[PDB]
XYZ file of N, CA and C in Angstrom:
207
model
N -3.098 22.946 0.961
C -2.039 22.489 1.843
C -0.775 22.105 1.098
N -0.471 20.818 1.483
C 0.855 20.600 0.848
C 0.508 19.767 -0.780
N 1.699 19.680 -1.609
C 1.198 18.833 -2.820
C 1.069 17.865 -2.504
N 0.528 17.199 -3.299
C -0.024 15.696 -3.118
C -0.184 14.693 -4.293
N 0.298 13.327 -4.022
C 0.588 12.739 -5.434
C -0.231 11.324 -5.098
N -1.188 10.969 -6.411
C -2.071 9.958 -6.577
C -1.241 8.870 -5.947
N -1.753 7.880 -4.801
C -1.365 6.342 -4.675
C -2.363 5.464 -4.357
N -1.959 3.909 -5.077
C -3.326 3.430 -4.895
C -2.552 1.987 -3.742
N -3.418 1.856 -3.014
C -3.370 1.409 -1.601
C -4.360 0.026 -1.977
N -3.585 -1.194 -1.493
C -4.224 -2.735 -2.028
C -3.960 -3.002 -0.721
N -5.100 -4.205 -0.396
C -5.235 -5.445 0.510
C -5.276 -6.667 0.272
N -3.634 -7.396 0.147
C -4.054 -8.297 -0.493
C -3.691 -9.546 0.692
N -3.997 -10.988 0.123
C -4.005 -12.036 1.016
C -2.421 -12.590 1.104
N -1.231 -12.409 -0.041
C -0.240 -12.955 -0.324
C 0.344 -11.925 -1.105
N 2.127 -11.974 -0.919
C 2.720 -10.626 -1.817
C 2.168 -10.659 -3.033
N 2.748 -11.428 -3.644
C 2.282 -11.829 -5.286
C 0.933 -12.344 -5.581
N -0.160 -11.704 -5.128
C -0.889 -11.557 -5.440
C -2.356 -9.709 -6.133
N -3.282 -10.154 -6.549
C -3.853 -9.027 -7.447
C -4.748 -8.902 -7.075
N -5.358 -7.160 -6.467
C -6.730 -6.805 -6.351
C -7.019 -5.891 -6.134
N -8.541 -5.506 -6.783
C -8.501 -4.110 -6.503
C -8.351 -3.193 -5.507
N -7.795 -1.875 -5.694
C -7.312 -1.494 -4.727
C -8.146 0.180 -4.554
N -7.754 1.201 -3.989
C -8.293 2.292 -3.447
C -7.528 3.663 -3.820
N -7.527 4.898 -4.256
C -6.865 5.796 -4.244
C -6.807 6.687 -3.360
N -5.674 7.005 -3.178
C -5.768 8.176 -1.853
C -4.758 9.078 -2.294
N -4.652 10.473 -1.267
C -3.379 11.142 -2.114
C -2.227 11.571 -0.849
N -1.586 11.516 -1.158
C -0.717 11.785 0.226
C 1.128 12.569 -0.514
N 1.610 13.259 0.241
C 2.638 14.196 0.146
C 3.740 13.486 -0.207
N 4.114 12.146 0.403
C 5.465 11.508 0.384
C 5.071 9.962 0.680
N 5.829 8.918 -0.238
C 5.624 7.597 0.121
C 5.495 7.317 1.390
N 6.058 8.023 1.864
C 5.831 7.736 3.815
C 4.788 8.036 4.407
N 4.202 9.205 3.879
C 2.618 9.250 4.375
C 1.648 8.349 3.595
N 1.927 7.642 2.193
C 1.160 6.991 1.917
C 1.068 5.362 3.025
N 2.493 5.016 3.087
C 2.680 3.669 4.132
C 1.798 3.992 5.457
N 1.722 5.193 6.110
C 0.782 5.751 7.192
C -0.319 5.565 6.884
N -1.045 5.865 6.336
C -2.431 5.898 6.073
C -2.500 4.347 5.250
N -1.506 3.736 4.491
C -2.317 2.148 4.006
C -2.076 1.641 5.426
N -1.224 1.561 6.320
C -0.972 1.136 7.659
C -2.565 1.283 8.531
N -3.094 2.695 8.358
C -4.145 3.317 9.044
C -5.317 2.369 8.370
N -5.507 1.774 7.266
C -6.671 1.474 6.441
C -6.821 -0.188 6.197
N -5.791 -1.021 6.722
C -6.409 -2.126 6.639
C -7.235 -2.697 7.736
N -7.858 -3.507 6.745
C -9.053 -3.890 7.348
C -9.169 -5.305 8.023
N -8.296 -6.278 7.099
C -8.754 -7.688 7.291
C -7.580 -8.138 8.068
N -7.428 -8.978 8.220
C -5.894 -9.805 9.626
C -5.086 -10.803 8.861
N -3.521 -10.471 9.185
C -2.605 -10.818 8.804
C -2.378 -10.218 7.505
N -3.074 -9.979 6.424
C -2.701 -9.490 4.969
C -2.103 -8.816 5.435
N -1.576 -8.152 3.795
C -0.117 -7.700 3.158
C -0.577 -6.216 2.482
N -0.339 -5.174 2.822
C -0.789 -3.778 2.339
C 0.446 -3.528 1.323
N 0.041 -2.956 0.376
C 0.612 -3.058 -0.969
C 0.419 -1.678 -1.663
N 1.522 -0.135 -1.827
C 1.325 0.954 -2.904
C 1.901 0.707 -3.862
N 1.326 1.309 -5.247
C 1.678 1.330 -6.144
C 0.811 2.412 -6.853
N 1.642 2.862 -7.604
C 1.133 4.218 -8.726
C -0.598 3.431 -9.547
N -1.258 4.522 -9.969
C -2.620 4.791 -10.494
C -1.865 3.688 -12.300
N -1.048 3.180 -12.517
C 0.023 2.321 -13.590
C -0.101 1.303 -13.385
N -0.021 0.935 -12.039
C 0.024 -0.770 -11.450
C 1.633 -0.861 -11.191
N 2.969 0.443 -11.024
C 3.851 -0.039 -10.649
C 3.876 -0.252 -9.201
N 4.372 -1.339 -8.700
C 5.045 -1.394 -7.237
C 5.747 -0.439 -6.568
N 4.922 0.474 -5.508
C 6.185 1.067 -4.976
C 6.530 -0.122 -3.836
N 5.752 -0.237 -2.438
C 6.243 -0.958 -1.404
C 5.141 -1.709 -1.290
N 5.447 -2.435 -0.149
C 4.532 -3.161 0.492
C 4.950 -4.134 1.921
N 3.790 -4.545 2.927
C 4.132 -4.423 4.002
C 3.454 -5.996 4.495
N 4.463 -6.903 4.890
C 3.703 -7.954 5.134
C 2.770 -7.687 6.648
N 1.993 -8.670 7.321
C 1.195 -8.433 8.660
C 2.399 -8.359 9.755
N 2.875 -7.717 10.563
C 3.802 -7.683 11.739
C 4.970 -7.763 10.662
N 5.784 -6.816 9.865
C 6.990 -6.795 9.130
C 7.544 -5.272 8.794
N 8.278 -5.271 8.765
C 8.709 -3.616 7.961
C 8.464 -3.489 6.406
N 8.391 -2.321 6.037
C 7.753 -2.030 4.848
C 9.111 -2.569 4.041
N 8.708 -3.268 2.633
C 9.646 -3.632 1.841
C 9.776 -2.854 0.656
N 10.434 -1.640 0.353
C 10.218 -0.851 -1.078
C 10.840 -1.707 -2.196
N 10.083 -1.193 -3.154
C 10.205 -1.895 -4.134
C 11.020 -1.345 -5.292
């Protein structure tokens, strides 16, 4: 299909916070925000991409718009 570039997708409790997270692969930062959007699990947390590096791309508080980083 289309290319696709490694992102790893976190659930965390607070922005500034650390944990392990999940890889998935998706075409464009925007389909990655779709699918971490599609994949949380727990209530109110903060969904968090960043490269297979540990850089920050975005992240999304509970009821907020995505904040890129």
């Amino acid at each position: 299909g289309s290319m696709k570039a490694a992102y790893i997708i976190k659930e965390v409790q607070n922005i500034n916070s650390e944990r392990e997270g999940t890889q998935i692969e998706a075409t464009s930062l925007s389909q990655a925000k779709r699918i971490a959007s599609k994949e949380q699990c727990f209530h109110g947390t903060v969904m968090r991409i960043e490269t297979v590096n540990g850089l920050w791309l975005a992240y999304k508080e509970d009821g907020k718009r995505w904040v890129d980083c």
